[PDB]
């Protein structure tokens, strides 16, 4: 079984958490795109969706699903999204797809965070297999890079990339993250950092993993 | 004298901190505008400036001063900026002029934060005379508004304002800030908040107050 098949398995299993006639919180990225197709498969069952990227929005509308603005809801029952790494404590590293800012915002509206992932995303130590994405105000790029290096990392600017919010992304190499909640908060106080890729203060509530033996739910 | 004359006195006094052949960090707002005019006065003594707003940038260029990008420097000797409130510990509330995000970015670059105010800006309790400005990603406006109400404030969207960074502002009324350091950190952890107007983790180093009796320096 290949990686795409596993993503499809997790996405299909996520449908079990979708409540009739309600608005679904949707993330961004390749695994979520599998979820957007799955959603189109049961669309009349839902009221619509709130999505974490303009790409996800366009795809959802292409499926005939109405897209609502986050500002139109006081909360969401669930938020379904993938991750670049996820540890046994359900803490994640996100941002490979450069949508981490709106992903953190939509996740904050949802009661239940359902992370859908292929088996390869499960790691014991966050940051060991994937560089930490950090979204940065453009004029703050150099000084945030200096802070990240002082913290022990090797920041690298993602060439030519701009987020839906108009910011740049610095990916931090050589930065194993032994204490995720602590680093998340610390980076949150750095001027110029819009969002950092550690989702630890509010991690996943449910983890759906696509494996060769089928989707496995950790709830 | 009125506040405009007190602002000019403080701005004139800030000049003594400007040294030759150096890039000056400059803020934004009515008091800084008096400082920019003062800077023009010694134009040729300085190398240039890094500014906290497009408006400050424009005024500086009109004074014949070269404007540099923050990314062009690794450090600034001083940063001159005003404030809406400042307490005896030199902690400030800023953002009346909607430039708080970039102001916090440039201030982080400077060795010495020089706050120039008229005497009406001195208060014993932050939030007692001025609603707290909070810059928010537009799609997160409603949810951040609900969080601010939960912390006990009365948030009000600043109608029609869009910051240099493309964001909106929520001004929090009836919100006395009894522990600025704690509150600044708490707000920095809210998804959707770009910057909050409490400058307490990094307050002013020098305070120059314009008074009917002349500018008074609190070094």
UniProtKB/Swiss-Prot annotation, chains A, B:
Substrate binds at residues 28-31, 81-84, 94-97, 121. It catalyses: aldehydo-D-ribose 5-phosphate = D-ribulose 5-phosphate. It holds the Pfam family Rib_5-P_isom_A. Its EC number is 5.3.1.6. One of its GO terms (cellular component) is cytosol. Gene3D superfamilies: 3.30.70.260, 3.40.50.1360. GO terms for biological process: D-ribose metabolic process; pentose-phosphate shunt, non-oxidative branch. Pathway: Carbohydrate degradation; pentose phosphate pathway; D-ribose 5-phosphate from D-ribulose 5-phosphate (non-oxidative stage): step 1/1. Keywords: Isomerase. GO terms for molecular function: ribose-5-phosphate isomerase activity. The active site is at 103 (proton acceptor). Homodimer. Catalyzes the reversible conversion of ribose-5-phosphate to ribulose 5-phosphate. NCBIfam families: PRK00702.1 (NF001924), rpiA (TIGR00021). Belongs to the ribose 5-phosphate isomerase family. This is Ribose-5-phosphate isomerase A.
């Amino acid at each position: 079984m290949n990686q795409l098949e596993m993503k499809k398995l997790a996405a299909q299993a996520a449908l079990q958490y979708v409540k009739a006639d309600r608005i679904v919180g949707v993330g961004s990225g390749s695994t979520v795109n599998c979820f957007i197709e799955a959603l189109g498969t049961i669309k009349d069952k839902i009221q619509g969706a709130v999505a974490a990227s303009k790409e996800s929005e366009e795809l959802l509308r292409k499926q005939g699903i109405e897209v609502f603005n986050a500002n139109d809801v006081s909360s969401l029952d669930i938020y379904v999204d993938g991750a670049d790494e996820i540890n046994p404590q359900k803490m994640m590293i996100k941002g490979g797809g450069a949508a981490l800012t709106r992903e953190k915002i939509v996740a904050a509206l949802a009661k239940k965070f359902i992370c859908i992932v292929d088996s390869s995303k499960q790691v014991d130590v966050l940051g060991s297999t994937f560089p930490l994405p950090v979204e940065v105000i453009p004029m703050a790029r150099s000084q945030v890079g200096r802070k990240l290096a002082a913290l022990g990392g090797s920041p690298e600017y993602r060439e030519g990339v701009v987020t839906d919010n108009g910011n740049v992304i610095l990916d931090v190499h050589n930065f194993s993250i032994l204490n995720p909640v602590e680093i998340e908060k610390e980076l949150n106080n750095v001027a110029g950092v819009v969002t950092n890729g550690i989702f630890a203060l509010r991690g996943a509530d449910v983890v759906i993993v696509g494996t060769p033996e089928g989707a496995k739910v950790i709830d």
